[PDB]
């Protein structure tokens, strides 16, 4: 492509799937939301940086817990597919931000080490 007609920009074929996040390292994902059920797609997620052994272990433990909590929040209404609203969860030393972004079908996540130091 030519920069006059097409200004430089990020490659849209390799986007950040999760919720925008400024912390490093961080795990982002775009979960598929159908009713009160959420689905994690490994190819619709990404990680910036490298989680430490301790934080990686904690992410493994916290992920299922976070998923279950988000599903309950969909069921109860704190997470509404039609309304943008960021919820914050904390688990195993990690912080998780989630938002439907009013996408009517997706739940965007950002998980990173809680800056407790």
Give the arrangement of secondary structure elements.
Elements (H helix, E strand, L loop, with lengths): L25 E9 L2 E3 L5 E4 L4 H24 L10 E5 L2 E6 L6 E8 L4
Number of beta strands = 6
How does the helix and strand content classify structurally?
alpha+beta
End-to-end Cα distance, whole Å, is: 46 Å
Total of domains: 1
CATH topology tier name: Beta-Lactamase
Largest sheet features = 6 strands, antiparallel
Task: Name the CATH architecture.
Answer: 2-Layer Sandwich
Approximate strand percentage: 25-35%
> Could you estimate the helical fraction of the residues in percent?
10-25%
Alpha carbon gyration radius = 15 Å
**Given the C-alpha coordinates, what overall shape results?**
globular
CATH class: Alpha Beta
What does this structure look like?
This protein has 117 residues and is an alpha+beta fold. The chain has a single domain, classed as PAS domain (Beta-Lactamase), CATH 3.30.450. The protein is 21% helix and 30% strand. Strands 1, 2, 3, 4, 5 and 6 form a six-stranded antiparallel beta sheet that branches. Strand 5 (94-99) and strand 6 (106-113) form a beta hairpin. The longest helix has 24 residues, at 53-76. It is globular.
């Amino acid at each position: 492509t030519l920069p006059g007609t097409t200004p430089p920009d990020d490659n849209h074929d390799r986007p950040w799937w999760g919720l925008p996040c400024t912390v490093t390292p961080c795990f982002g994902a775009r979960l598929v939301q159908e009713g009160n059920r959420l689905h994690y797609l490994a190819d619709r997620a990404g990680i910036r940086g490298r989680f430490s052994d301790v934080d990686a272990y904690h992410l493994d433990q916290a992920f299922p817990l976070l998923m279950k909590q988000l599903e309950l929040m969909l069921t109860g209404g704190e997470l509404n597919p039609r309304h943008q609203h960021t919820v914050t969860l904390y688990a195993k030393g990690l912080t998780c931000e989630a938002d439907t972004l009013g996408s009517c079908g997706y739940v965007y996540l950002a998980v990173y080490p809680t800056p407790a130091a």
